[PDB]
Symmetry: none
Subunit: 147 residues, 8 copies
């Protein structure tokens, strides 16, 4: 389960991570004491994982974002590319996928010429071929849907 008072909470917190123990308890129909517990139980069970402010990447100097799809070159070696690229800070996300390639990464970078460097570094560090698709614009990002 996830009792649908727990549900109203996760919707509220997904839409506004700074929402207060206080103002939640109105919309929810509970007490500042009662709300505060569910939330701690929600963080312990792995349901809310973190609270993050959403930073605009262009404002901090990331003018090019890209999906980078990668496939290991040598199948006799352990396929450990996520772990291998983890220290690379410009990889924001790393997914395994069912398609032509094995993983998709979302990468942010200062310019077209920084991407070229990142790609070579991805390639020599994990041991992969790269294919990259450049993002032109983000129309909306992380609208978590709670069903």
């Amino acid at each position: 389960a996830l009792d649908d008072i727990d549900r109203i909470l996760v919707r509220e917190l997904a839409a506004d991570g700074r929402a207060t123990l206080s103002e939640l308890a109105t919309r929810a129909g509970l007490s500042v004491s009662a709300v505060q517990s569910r939330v701690r139980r929600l963080e312990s069970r792995g349901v809310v994982q973190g609270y993050s402010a959403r930073i605009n990447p262009e404002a901090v100097g990331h003018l090019l974002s890209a999906f980078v799809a990668i496939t290991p070159l040598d199948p006799s070696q352990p396929d450990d590319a996520p772990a291998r690229l983890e220290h690379i800070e410009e990889v924001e996300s790393c997914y395994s996928v069912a398609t032509e390639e094995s993983y998709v990464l979302l990468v942010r970078v200062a310019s077209a010429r920084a991407l070229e460097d990142l790609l070579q570094r991805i390639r020599t560090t994990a041991n992969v071929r790269t294919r990259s698709t450049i993002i032109l614009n983000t129309f909306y990002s992380d609208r978590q849907h709670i069903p």
Copy 2:
């Protein structure tokens, strides 16, 4: 215009979006008022776009995630697609992309059968062909990097 103080605030708010101002203050060597001021300006300029609990899509019943690349059936018409799909809730992100397709969506759904039904809804509301890549596993995501 992002000075060293602003840089520090956005790193801390990326790592913890419920950082209270008193903690941010003592971390940037400012007063709580000056922090609150900086933070508000970060919000009203482009830089912090909102704050969100990072929610486990599995815990809430989204067992299948996919990327869907979409391309308009008639590309001559100025293109509507992000605005028209905005109201389908299981679409979480929408990027326009270079190369052969026009947009990539991330989508989350309860099952295989709910995915095929969503693909129909997407094909019809944006008037688009679709190419889907199921995500098998998320190794890490949203690791935002402030340089």
Copy 3:
């Protein structure tokens, strides 16, 4: 022809468009009067077309450059895409080509998201499909070779 004193002049002027009527006449082996004429004859015959300082595009805010290859969609219409895109100032160059596409344009633009707009504008204005290749770095540009 192009008498190989005329040749030494075009090499000199290709390498340095600010080279003086004066200092040319040493390297060339002629008079400030004699040099000045050849040059005016070279500008009248269509040989030197202009003098331009080479501006670094990043310094003026063009952070992304791209080749954009385009092919008219309707072959019953006059193929006039160069003329049609001429007023678009971000098209720096426009070539017809023998390959998969009919023309190649070199385009410069503020960001990845400005490119997306430019592409739609190219498409609705000339009546074309677009394919774009993003430039990551210019290692050297316009080294005119005089044989």
Copy 4:
């Protein structure tokens, strides 16, 4: 850092690279000394990269121009190719590019037979496969745009 005055100087030098300082001065409302100073700073920072007579490649015997995309035979080695081709004179420009190939060259040559011979030289000196696109006509080029 480009103020309004600097912007004016680079537009004028783009449109006429032999603008004399007295003309630039009266155009920016500065003294000839202040102009000369501005111009020198533009040169030593990245902004003006040199000055060139724009030469008609046909008048000097280059009747064939081509784009050549190149890709390394062994991409694992750190990539040398722009440095190694720098000394082939009929290569006019060298860009690195996203997508499937690594660089695009512009090349000018006297004839079809001289093109095949250049392709061999390129294949061997950079150790690369080549894809050529002949240019049939130049409608306009180098129209530099200062925004």
Copy 5:
């Protein structure tokens, strides 16, 4: 029906098309009249198709030669293409071919720009897609072999 005498005449006329009859006669052990007769019959049956000075395409200004394979846009229509291209003069030869394309042309032209213009003329007059292979060098050609 080619006897030994006829075989000798066609070898000599292949190697020297201005062989005079007196030289051909003494070479085949015939009279000048019998030679002239044989030669006329060779002409009126299929065997000698005409006589030509072999001309250096470079000396006359054709610096670029190419093969162009062509394939009809609509292959259902009985195919016109050799008859329709017969009147484009820079087409030197026209073969129909097995495999994926329908014809191969040899074409000679003054430069890269004149090639792109010819490709347009070919695409439009025969209604065909084109695949071009530039010839870099001719090592030997027309070495006719009589077995």
Copy 6:
């Protein structure tokens, strides 16, 4: 140059290699003495190279003609395939090319089964892979265009 009386001569001789010193001098507007010199100067300068009668290949037993495209297998060896195949008499022509393959040969042969032999012999003698395209019909051959 090539003075356009020289031009009328090469057109005439390209169309009819047996055209007489005599009958040329009408069409040309010169003397049997004057015509005869230009022609000898044309043969000395490399402009007319030979006179050949055009033999129909089917009439002499060449029932299959083919283009054979070839690429050396070992790039550490000297690329000398033209020289190596020169003694092979069924190779009528040998070109170097810019495309997927390095050379194109035109070959004539008694039958489909003789081609199979020729191909193996090409392969073991030069050291090459072969790709062959079979000619079904020659609609016209060697129409030299004098511009």
Copy 7:
């Protein structure tokens, strides 16, 4: 079944269709009466279908043989290509196949230029795309194996 005296007969007749009722009866171990019956029972049950002398196709003027693979163009129409091509006498064999194409035909024809005609006729008569593979040599043909 097929009693293995019946088997010795079919082997014998496959190897030699002119083998006599007489000489079979030795090798087989039966009577001129007994052999003659099995054979008539073998022709009635559909086991031996015909007796044919194997004609060399080159000796009768078929200098090119080809496999021609074909696929109907319109799947709303009945797929009846075997029946439609049956009157075409140069189709020796017609098979349906599991692969990229729907049928394979073996075709024999006077020359490369007759094949081109046959192909167009196959295409307009059945309603198919064609792909042809040319036979260079038959090393052995119809060795029926009786297991």
Copy 8:
């Protein structure tokens, strides 16, 4: 050399390979001796290659037929493959072919499992890679055509 009489005999022997001489004689207006003579000459020259009962491959237990294209693992060695496969009995025909593969075989086998085992035997005895196309149905075969 095939006159009208010879043409008639090969048609009749194609349609019925057990035609007795008396029937062939009265059909060609010859004596039985002259027929027997003609037939013997047809045999000793290339023209009639043998005589065969056409046997139903199904009736004798070959329920699966396939085409197998084969290509040598090392094509530099003069090619052995038809001689080496001659002794595998379930190979019925062997052609060499133009294009990408070197030979096509027709093969008949009792079942899917017997096919995989034959593919191994082929791969190993000729040292070849294989591409198989199962035959689903034979609509007509061996319809020999005498023109």
